[PDB]
Amino acid sequence: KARIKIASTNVRSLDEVANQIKQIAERTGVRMSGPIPLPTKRIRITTRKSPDGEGSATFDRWELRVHKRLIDIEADERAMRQIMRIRVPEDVTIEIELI
Amino acid sequence: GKIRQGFIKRVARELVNKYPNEFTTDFEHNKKKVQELTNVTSKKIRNRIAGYVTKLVRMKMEG
Amino acid sequence: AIERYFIREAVREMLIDEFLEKELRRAGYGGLDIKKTPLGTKVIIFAANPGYVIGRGGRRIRELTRILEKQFGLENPQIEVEEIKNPYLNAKVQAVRLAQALERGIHFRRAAYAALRAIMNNGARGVEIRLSGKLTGERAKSIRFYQGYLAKVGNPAETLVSKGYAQALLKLGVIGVKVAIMPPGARLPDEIEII
Amino acid sequence: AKADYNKRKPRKFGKGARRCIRCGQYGPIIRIQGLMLCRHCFREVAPKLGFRKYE
Amino acid sequence: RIIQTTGKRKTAIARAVIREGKGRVRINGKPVEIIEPEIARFTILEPLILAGEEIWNSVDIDVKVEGGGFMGQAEAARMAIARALVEWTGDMSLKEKFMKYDRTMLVGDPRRTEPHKPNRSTKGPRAKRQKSYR
Amino acid sequence: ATVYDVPGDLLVERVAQRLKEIPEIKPPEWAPFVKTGRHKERLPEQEDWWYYRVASILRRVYLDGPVGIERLRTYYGGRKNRGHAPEKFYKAGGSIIRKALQQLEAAGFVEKVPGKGRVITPKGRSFLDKIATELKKELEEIIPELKKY
Amino acid sequence: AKPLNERFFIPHEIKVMGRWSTEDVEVRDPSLKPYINLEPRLLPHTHGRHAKKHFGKANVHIVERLINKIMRSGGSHYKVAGHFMRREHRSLNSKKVKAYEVVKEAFKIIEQRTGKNPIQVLVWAIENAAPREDTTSVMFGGIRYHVAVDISPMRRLDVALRNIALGASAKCYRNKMSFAEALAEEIILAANKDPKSYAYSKKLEIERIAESSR
């Protein structure tokens, strides 16, 4: 079996990669486990606006969201070559492991 | 405060003038046809326009 | 963790962009793009005047690759130079050009009006240029030249518009130049029409 | 005149072991995710680093 | 016939399973008759007393509750039990009685915590530091 | 009838009374001169608190087993009066819990699950269940609503 | 201490607290009758839900109102019995279980000592402690005047409950009397019209000032 974890800061790129993998699996005819959406990771940083100490304190909360999807497939020669031939856009990160 | 918007009122008036027979006093039907006939992409705005066109049709039928 | 990789990549892109902005001020710098390839990394630099970026004999490009690899730690980088899609719609480039004109010594009013007219005639819904600093005397001022339609409050103003800022180092001090441009084809939520 | 002086001694902890990569400050360094960025720098930088102010 | 229902209150989620039995109601495996405090026990018991002895001694209920406090879990279990009873008997008169007595037994409670804000945060959204004025 | 059908304290006290008989559970020599946690101000006021603590530990192993020293310490901790400083939560000591668990193991009521903790053996399970059954039989007379259970 | 039967009391009918029924409770004052809610209710706990609405507390059971009023500190910006009762960390604020237990004990004491319905005695106390007139500043022309005004039924109920709770707190403050005993004594005294009660004394004070200023 092969487990693939795909994470990105762009939901559209995430979905594009997921759809490409799904199409590859469908054309190869191999059963595929649907994309598991893992909980989004939200990095929040709260910072004081003023560069000095004078004035009423005000803060801004800058948030960076990272979205994660998981897929499980059964290993095959053509399927795995096609998957390794994925586009993997710049903002998406892909990890492949075998079980 | 709850007052209708300028562009909402203008869009409703021009829509009802352009398609007199394509709207009635039914909010659901007005909503469907507003979504079909307008480039609106917001559900809230679409509901605004649909409600106001329903009001305009009611006024017309009243006289 | 995975967030640590995202953060390191963002920070590296930061430092490279800032260094290139310092280096290519006179080259009409517009931005950069970094991509990963099996052999290494590829860096595309958008410049209105690739002549300066390439230099004579390729020495500038050679040294730039050397620096961006050793100092910034990128892995086997290859640098390509491209033209700006439209220099008159990139706010940063226009701000840098106006600052350079002020440094040259053109009257601020004439330079601002010329830049505004050129940007408007090159295609834009609206434009606004703010000049702040020691103008017309020792007491600093802040004058704005505006034309067309523009937005400054809300998500449309945050996203649609392009903003740039630059500093002109004259003899009497620093002048701040701010440029905001609304590119053509941008539709505000208020604009809807029958189909 | 030797060069053994004029050199910062090695430091592994304290406010003297962290600096802003962009500013060189010594005070409010953000280490939330290894940013190593000063408070002012991060504030001026957040929109274009991928961070956003959703609400 | 096994029937499942859900109830939510604040951060408390209760899943109730109802079947045919003798009248055994268990919350997390512990009988409802020894629920402490009496306030929470009464909150849990109210729907059954409203329904009556006949229906009460005709069904068995097992409730699993997570999250929240001792009152939130009790109210979530109350909602789950009320919904399970209503759907099990299918009695519109009983549903009407429940609605008139307490609309919240069948309908959830939308109220949630309002996020805190600066100026003495960690105390509340609107709590503010005392101002010196001089 | 089992542990889940009986209030915790009424069962714990009875288990302590019953455990006073078993010879493998004896207070340590340092028991009289020790508090039950750094967060406690004054040492116990029972003179037989050891048996109550051991019964509580046994019931905890029965319910949430397998468990360990650190998690039992978390359970047995509590708020501390720090004086002018605000109140804060702290864990409990480890020697009491470790010795209680070792004594229970010697008695045969618990056993070590390697890398996981300590789990109740069938003998201890039967002991606790018998005590709970007796308590429930006693309670049923006062509360008729518990008969059906 | 208390019997296991009381510890694990299991109600089987819909009545106030599962022990006392309000079917026989009688309210005379026609002004206050539409506002003293006596509908069947097992647990007097509505989790608020009546603050959003206007006149939304006119449908909250009287015992729940009493519990909410008891849940307090006693005094922070107003002096009670010539003293402040600023209980910071030992107050009953946000402890509805404690307020509920205190009210239960007070009702038990009232029934033991009187032989009648504790809720009926509480009703009587409210009727006796509800003022009928007050005074306020009203401006006509360019200056103010100290005029006399009436009190609406809901304000009368609010004042009565507030006075009863404040009297109970004052009686219990730094005294051998427990809170439940203080509340029971205050309610009984208000029902009996004995001027010793804080509620009756304050009602008479407001009444006399209003009469003098009218």
Next chain:
RNA sequence: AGGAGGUGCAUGGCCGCCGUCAGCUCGUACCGUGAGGCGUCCACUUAAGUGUGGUAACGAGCGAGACCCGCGCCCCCAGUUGCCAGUCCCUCCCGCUCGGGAGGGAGGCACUCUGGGGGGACUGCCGGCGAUAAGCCGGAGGAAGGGGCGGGCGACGGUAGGUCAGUAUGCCCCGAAACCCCCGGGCUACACGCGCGCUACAAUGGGCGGGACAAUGGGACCCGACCCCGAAAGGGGAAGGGAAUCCCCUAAACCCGCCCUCAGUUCGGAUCGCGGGCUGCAACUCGCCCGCGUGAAGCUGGAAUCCCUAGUACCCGCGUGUCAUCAUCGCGC
């Protein structure tokens, strides 16, 4: 070269206040010799220069709204690292097992959950008021009735308001000193005035034993389950975890049982003695923790003054930022 030397009365950028206030303006026409005026006024309405109607003005721009994020209801898809309701097997326990309960495997995703796309709420309907409009009050249905609830976004300008000691920077100055490094000290001093807080002045309690229920977030010289040692602090080995898989993490307020019974007390825990530890190259100036010992004001507070309209206020604890150690603090749960 360098400069945390001066100048924020030379600047940029940034930020607080006017102010999330509703205001600030433009094209043409018209009135006035002119500065200027009209539009931007009047009646009603709105949180709003929000909108209807009348007019020497007709249109328009930037603000407001729109917009963006999250919460609450329902449907579709998705079933792992998340979940265990039904069904099978194994093991154990109880009133001797009719019956009931627990755990592990297979199995399922049924419910919760995570996260993508959609629906729903729109004065849409009814009665009344206003004038038939703008709109307002109440009612039915509904999860959500009137800006759905909370937030992000701060207009033309001013405030010579704060910031050169965060970075940049004009002028002035040191330039072998004001530049750069090393030890030691200070920023921690203490007759006294003030701001914001913690603990308390007790029974709406203190102590002792026992019984319950969370969420947000973080983890590589890092979190560390689990076992052994110690009375506590703490010490030795060490599984697992780059994370829906492991851990931080079995919170307190609360509930039961016993003692105390109105007392400067079994309240209150300042202030010192002795001893044991942790971090750190270094603990005296000047760190934190632990056991025993003593037990200072304080018994509710004048004038005056502060915050808050619903899961809000009040009470109760926890996460994180600062961190080798140190949270009576900020931001959140």
